[PDB]
């Protein structure tokens, strides 16, 4: 018996934020001088650079984007919530290398879900 | 980009930590073993989250330490080729620009910075377009596209990542706004 | 449950090996006792954490 993968799911930047701050508080309470190692704190800086949406509301946004459409995957909703697109150009670039291109009406719907 | 992976694994728990409960000991051993390393297929192991189920130990001849089947979630960040990237420029160099994409830094070649010709101004050690009068300086926030990923070893430092910047829909947010203005102008004419 | 000779030998050897690497002794032992003698004392007392599995 060796390493094996049992599951896999994609997450937003805000979740990584709150999880790494949980790690930080645990290590600070433990008394560690550097709560997260150097790569971990660089990742935390990047996460706090673009954590636009609060974590719980980020979950609600991802679940709403899941409920709205069926052609998109979990990673698609995660990166959409990370990007925060405002018009057709940003989402066109997001899906530019993706195999699927949605109708601009669904693009308006994505912007609406972002607004709520 | 960040993701959560549930992994089954066998943990060698040394006799010195037999006092504490198996969950915390397995957590610690996984912190020492996986955390802070690069994996070829899932990215960079960032933080072990928690362990759900830990099995009873198996004593194998030779060492005397217990081996346990474990199930745990690892927060791992995976770069994907031909995707979108949001980040700020940590530093710039004459051969390319360093773009912060998360746990690791990406490289944007000067040949991919602009369709216009670029020159590395040494007055502030910054880039500047020849005719567009655009510039890149340390601390600028830019949007780019990842195009190449290379993984040498489990050390995150050694592995390098290269991005592209000229392609439409990318650039400094001010340049993106200017391109949007041009799109509106051509739609209004 | 009656241990065989080989099961007893494996249990005592594993326990002594664990004790030699800092696993705390589950009983009180006289000073100067070698780890193997400590494991044998543990087995004779009856406090045996290691369990053998059979098909």
From TrEMBL, chain A:
Subcellular location per the Swiss-Prot or TrEMBL entry: Cytoplasm
GO molecular function: DNA-directed RNA polymerase activity; nucleotide binding
Keyword Zinc-finger: no
EC number(s) reported in the record: 2.7.7.6
GO cellular component terms, A-Z: cytoplasm; DNA-directed RNA polymerase complex
Main location: cytoplasm
Enzyme class, UniProt record, top EC level: transferase
UniProt-listed GO biological process terms: DNA-templated transcription initiation
Pfam families recorded: RNA_pol_Rpb4 (PF03874)
Highest taxon listed in the record's lineage: Archaea
Self-association and partners: Part of the RNA polymerase complex. Forms a stalk with Rpo7 that extends from the main structure.
Family listed: Belongs to the eukaryotic RPB4 RNA polymerase subunit family.
Record's protein name: DNA-directed RNA polymerase subunit Rpo4
From TrEMBL, chain B:
EC number: 2.7.7.6
Superkingdom classification of source: Archaea
Keyword Transcription in annotation: yes
Principal cellular location given in the protein's record: cytoplasm
Any Gene Ontology biological process: DNA-templated transcription initiation
Pfam families: S1 (PF00575), SHS2_Rpb7-N (PF03876)
Domain S1 motif: 82-166
GO molecular-function terms, A-Z: DNA binding; DNA-directed RNA polymerase activity
Reaction catalyzed: RNA(n) + a ribonucleoside 5'-triphosphate = RNA(n+1) + diphosphate
Function per UniProt: DNA-dependent RNA polymerase (RNAP) catalyzes the transcription of DNA into RNA using the four ribonucleoside triphosphates as substrates.
UniProt record similarity statement: Belongs to the eukaryotic RPB7/RPC8 RNA polymerase subunit family.
Keyword Transmembrane appears in the UniProt entry: no
Key words, A-Z: Cytoplasm, DNA-directed RNA polymerase, Nucleotidyltransferase, Transcription, Transferase
Complexes and interactors: Part of the RNA polymerase complex. Forms a stalk with Rpo4 that extends from the main structure.
Assigned GO CC terms: cytoplasm; DNA-directed RNA polymerase complex
Entry comment, domain topic: Forms 2 domains with an elongated structure; Rpo4 packs into the hinge region between the 2 domains.
Gene: rpo7
Listed name of the protein: DNA-directed RNA polymerase subunit Rpo7
Cellular compartments annotated: Cytoplasm
EC class (word): transferase
């Amino acid at each position: 018996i060796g390493r094996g993968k049992l599951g896999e799911k994609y997450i937003t930047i805000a979740e990584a934020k709150e999880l790494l701050l949980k790690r930080r508080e645990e290590e600070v309470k433990a008394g560690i001088e550097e709560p997260l190692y150097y790569e971990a704190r660089l990742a935390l800086e990047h996460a706090e650079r673009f954590a636009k949406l609060p974590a719980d509301k980020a979950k609600e946004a991802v679940e709403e984007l899941m409920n709205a459409f069926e052609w998109m995957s979990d990673r698609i909703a995660c990166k959409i919530v990370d990007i925060m697109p405002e018009d057709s150009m940003d989402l066109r670039v997001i899906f530019a290398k993706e195999e699927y291109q949605p109708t601009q009406e669904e693009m308006k719907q994505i912007l609406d879900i972002l607004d709520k | 980009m960040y993701k959560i992976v549930t992994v089954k694994d066998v943990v060698r728990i040394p006799p010195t930590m037999f006092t504490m409960d198996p969950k915390e000991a397995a957590k610690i051993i996984l912190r020492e073993t996986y955390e802070g390393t690069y994996d070829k297929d899932e990215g960079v192991i960032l933080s072990i989250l928690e362990v759900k189920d830990i099995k009873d130990g198996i004593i194998i001849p030779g060492d005397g330490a217990t081996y346990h089947e474990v199930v745990f979630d690892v927060l791992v960040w995976e770069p994907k080729i031909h995707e979108v990237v949001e980040g700020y420029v940590a530093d710039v160099m004459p051969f390319g620009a360093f773009i912060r994409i998360g746990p690791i830094d990406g490289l944007v070649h000067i040949s991919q910075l602009m369709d216009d010709y670029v020159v590395y101004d040494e007055r502030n050690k910054q880039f500047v377009g020849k005719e567009k009068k655009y510039l890149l300086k340390i601390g600028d926030l830019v949007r780019a596209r990842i195009i190449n990923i290379s993984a040498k070893s489990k050390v995150i430092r050694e592995n390098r990542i290269g991005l592209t910047m000229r392609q439409p829909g990318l650039g400094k947010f001010e340049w993106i706004e200017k391109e949007k203005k041009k799109e509106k102008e051509e739609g209004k004419k | 449950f009656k241990y065989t000779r080989f099961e007893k030998a494996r249990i005592i050897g594993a326990r002594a090996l664990q004790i030699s690497m800092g696993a705390p002794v589950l009983i009180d032992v006289p000073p100067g006792i070698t780890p193997l003698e400590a494991a044998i004392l543990e087995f004779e007392k009856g406090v045996i954490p290691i369990t053998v599995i059979r098909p």
